[PDB]
Symmetry: C3
Subunit: 445 residues, 3 copies
């Protein structure tokens, strides 16, 4: 993928192109089980040190089960849910009588198995840990008899190793009220996640995609605690399904565009709004305003559509013609000419105002460019850093072509006296109509 | 508790009723101690593998103590403190001479004990781990002699198990500058927290409440590191006291209300402000503007009053009469008619504008409702999902009654030419006075 | 350091003085290595319990290596990087052929060593864990032979202890896409961090500073995963270099200043903007608008300059003369007279409006001050708490002098009819010019 960039001197904005989409549009839920031991505490005459270690680890197992039980009695809402409703619907099905016996039968001989639930959902079930088998075969002869049998030291160590994952899962579920994201390796090991991806009803390009970006998949997944019932600990892992793939995506960067008069109070400023990630999606554009909602790997963006707005494709025209009537290009205005910089994908936008010392340097040559007052841009070819005031920014060293699109700063087309200089969410045409109204108040007088 | 909802078509807003309050109004501090060993490193001729394992674990114990000591030399401020000032006042009392000896005497024979501090605060002290007893009885004969004694392998394992909680507490305290929240099971086990709740000077309904919502209690508690002095590691657990209980609470949901003309630039929009949680409190209303400050379990809201504003009870009138003079109903205005949806407790508000494809579907029947341009609502009875543009929302499947309160959208009562369309925090009456002023500028001409 | 405070009754704002700066201006990168074993899985006839435990722990080691390898195949971007570009440049140098052999040679005999990389960067390299030596000397005779040798139980325990740090580092790197901050003790132990600080090319006051604030240093550091190649696991720890030291720093606190008429809709409000931390820096002022970007220890502020704005030193005049022409003092206006309080360093600002019950109490005397409608302040001498509505705030008990600078509230100098009451980012002079324009629209009529 070739990354390119375009700086628009007229609007103090830049667009980083060449990115490929992967938008989450669906969920794939899967049930993860832990076979438990319904054993109850047993006391026999015991004093030998190995028996003490076993009984100690057994109490940590019993507390882990009772803690998961009181966690499951009352499960907290997470702000209208919605991003978890798929998995929550599976946990509600699991509470039906006979449903845990169904998964208990399918995972009787193998670790993984597909199960058709009683609501038409074909889930992939897995049994990642078997504590009932270990406790009932290796532990019960030690406490369940009348006088305690003496266990070998390998058993004490093996039981602390096996019981550890149960304790860590209970720890994560306790501090997070039953809903964890990202999904840890305790909830699902990388081996188990990759095997679950491979066993999913998705295309081979989607398996290659999710398997090559497992850390992003983990960060966009949920682990929801279901139920403890009949020697079964069940919880749902909700994995992202990327319904939108390889569509063009671009990132808009904006910076304040002010006039540069020498008398403070005589300068006006404007800034394009709606900076962030845009991706082509189903004849429209999916816009992601929040900064943390899109993870980038290589030239691929991984977004969740739940945090997006759907805009007409004409919103891209704000990048080629901001004065263009097919879409009302939104701006904000002010008189706050404070210097700043924005590090883009292939360079840096610099808004320099007042007495601020703005420059672009190379590590061994020193200052190679001094910015004047206004908004400007520099590519990363030959530039390592950008300094604005007392702050030093590092330029991204990604290879790509930048294009400096020269043009008159549009802030110069505005008469300062009638400019609306404190708008917080104004359109280009909205500002023009407010100027037409301020010109009518002066026209009559 | 019966959950009900009311959608106001006139203002594009909904109120989810029937919730019960639990507001934090106080703090209950309690001291958690770990009895340490003032042992110093001892070297004897040692080479046997068991001695090596013991000395290794002993170095991890010594580093944990010195790390807690350098953490305690300089303890960082957490933004004016205040939400921790109770516990901080107890740590400052603990630094007095003789105060650690007081708790050291009360916890000499039992694990838990009430201690009257020298500042009038009756704290509950607990001794959750005893490393001085284990190290001095089981470890000192191994290194403190002239030539090392050989320990049995059970001791090596028992010491790694006992020392683990100390190491994990030091780990959490190191990355968080001595203040952790939520309070982990390492800081306080569920058994110890429930026993501390049971032993608190509170009513039985408050013990049942905190014991049935321990994960919410943990998320609203603080663990503050106090002092390492005289073989004692002390830290304060600050637990919430809910002074407001079972008062009605409701959640306000708002969405943009625009006009639906076919020419862009001719539409005006308004949105009610102050969406969030409201709870009746002491003759006024406690409002919670931040989204993460209230955890909901069942029909109970658990808020911290520190993040609230106190409003007159007349603020509820913005839900029945927004044009009502007892309270100045606040709105924001704009021309940004971008489609969106809000998932409520019992349905979904949909603001559909432009060419956006808005619909409500059932999983097996398909599209059951198509929204027209404007603001509308659909209940969760028979609806599973709501799609707006390229985004699919899941409706909460909670049982309850919705009431669709029909009414003329108030945005239609405004002449567009004189509407103030870029207000960021305007009142209903503020907009009307600004319209009266814009009508005076046209009246004279 | 003497902490002082000044409340300006005229502007409802306070300044907390006497703080010393420590601003991050540079990065010191250092390479942290783990010597790995390129062993491959070996199967021999094995059934004895000790052999099983060893092979189990060996599989956890092999998965940890393959997981770090698939994490290193595709490393995610973190929003234009920049705050990590130093360490990222070192990881890119490390990918060159012969560079891992260079650090492999320098750390052949000692744990720490300075290495001149092939790009002119003199990094400090460290070898914190040696798994190749342990696996190849103690483990290979157990599986690599034809039939398995029987290991002693001390080896099983020693290998679980040594392998643990590798597994935890892989766990943190897996959930965080290769970039962790703060830097945990697994990434770098306190002993290793202090030794790295001591071995840094910095002054002795900077070593005393970083060593006395290691938790703040950890919170302002990054751990970046580099490469797995040729029996070497390498990752860069990027530590802050504080180029600005002991410069005066002050914290500005602001609260709404409204008029107190008895008829709602007739009151106007103003609030000073740009509250936060200000520090003198190189002839200008470095301002930190975000609340979480500055950690305070003692009277020292630790900020990262990346999150700062550079302002002229005349910005301090907004604290002594807000109507002063050398700097255009910024404000926001509204009609939202909701009561609130701000806990400062030495007292509390209280904005009381409407019917709100505002008071300041002592724990044993009760209410010692009742605030009237308007903006006021109380020092912490004799005051423990401040109650506003249903909310109780704790006053910081830090010792210092407060100065109440009496003055007429500037909101009283404004005629309400022509006040711009919905400005979101207005200057004092901007509001005056907008008033001059509203006076011209009434002057003609
Ligand atoms: C403002 O005036 C210009 C000039 O006649 C006109 O073209 C424009 O449509 C008017 N209104 C707006 C909203 O720009
Ligand atoms: C605006 O005009 C109406 C009509 O006379 C009046 O009732 C109202 O009080 C005026 N002022 C405001 C602030 O609404
Ligand atoms: C507003 O009017 C006053 C009075 O003449 C004048 O001093 C001031 O410069 C004018 N303009 C502004 C922007 O304050």
């Amino acid at each position: 993928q070739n990354i390119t960039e375009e700086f628009y001197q007229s609007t103090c904005s830049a667009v980083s192109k060449g990115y490929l989409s992967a938008l989450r549009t669906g969920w794939y839920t899967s049930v993860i089980t832990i076979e438990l031991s319904n054993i109850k505490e047993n006391k026999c005459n015991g004093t030998d040190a190995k028996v003490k270690l076993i009984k100690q680890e057994l109490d940590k197992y019993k507390n882990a089960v009772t803690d998961l039980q009181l966690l499951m009695q009352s499960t907290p809402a997470t702000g209208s849910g919605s991003a978890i409703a798929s998995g929550v619907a599976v946990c509600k099905v699991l509470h039906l009588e006979g449903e845990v016996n169904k998964i208990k039968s399918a995972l009787l001989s193998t670790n993984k198995a597909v199960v058709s639930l009683s609501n038409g959902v074909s889930v992939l079930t897995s049994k990642v840990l078997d504590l009932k088998n270990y406790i009932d075969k290796q532990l019960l002869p030690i406490v369940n008899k009348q006088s305690c049998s003496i266990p070998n030291i390998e058993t004490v160590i093996e039981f602390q190793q096996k019981n550890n994952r149960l304790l860590e899962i209970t720890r994560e579920f306790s501090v997070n009220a039953g809903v964890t994201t990202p999904v840890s390796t305790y909830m699902l090991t990388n081996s188990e996640l990759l095997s679950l991806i491979n066993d999913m009803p998705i295309t081979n390009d989607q398996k290659k995609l999710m398997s090559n970006n497992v850390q992003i998949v983990r960060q966009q997944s949920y682990s929801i605690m279901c139920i403890i019932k009949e020697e079964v600990l069940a919880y749902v892992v909700q994995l992202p399904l990327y319904g939108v793939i390889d569509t063009p995506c671009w990132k808009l960067h904006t910076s304040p565009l002010c006039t540069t008069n020498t008398k403070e109070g005589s300068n006006i400023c404007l800034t394009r709004t709606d900076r962030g990630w845009y991706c082509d999606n189903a004849g429209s554009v999916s816009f992601f305003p929040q900064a943390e909602t899109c993870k980038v790997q290589s030239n691929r963006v991984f977004c969740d559509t739940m945090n997006s707005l759907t805009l007409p494709s004409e919103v891209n025209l704000c990048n080629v013609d901001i004065f263009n009537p097919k879409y009302d290009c939104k701006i904000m205005t002010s008189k706050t000419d404070v210097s700043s910089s924005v590090i883009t994908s292939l360079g840096a936008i610099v808004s320099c105002y007042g007495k601020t010392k703005c420059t672009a340097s190379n590590k061994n040559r020193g200052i190679i460019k001094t910015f004047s007052n206004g908004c400007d841009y520099v590519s990363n070819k030959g530039v390592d850093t950008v300094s604005v005031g007392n702050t030093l920014y590092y330029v991204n060293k990604q290879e790509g072509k930048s294009l400096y699109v020269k043009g008159e700063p549009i802030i110069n087309f505005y008469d300062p006296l009638v400019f609306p200089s404190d708008e917080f969410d104004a359109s280009i045409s909205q500002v023009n109509e407010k100027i037409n109204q301020s010109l009518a108040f002066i026209r009559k007088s």
